[PDB]
Amino acid sequence: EEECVRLYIQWLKDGGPSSGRPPPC
């Protein structure tokens, strides 16, 4: 996948902009 289509989305699972990181996407 991609920074977005993996990392971010994974990040998005973490909570996205509530996850703690800024969106990879």
Side-chain angles (χ1 to χ4, degrees):
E1 272 65 272
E2 163 179 275
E3 91 178 303
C4 174
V5 331
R6 190 168 181 198
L7 305 185
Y8 152 76
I9 315 191
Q10 192 285 272
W11 170 89
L12 270 182
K13 271 65 153 317
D14 295 307
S18 293
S19 76
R21 327 62 151 97
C25 204

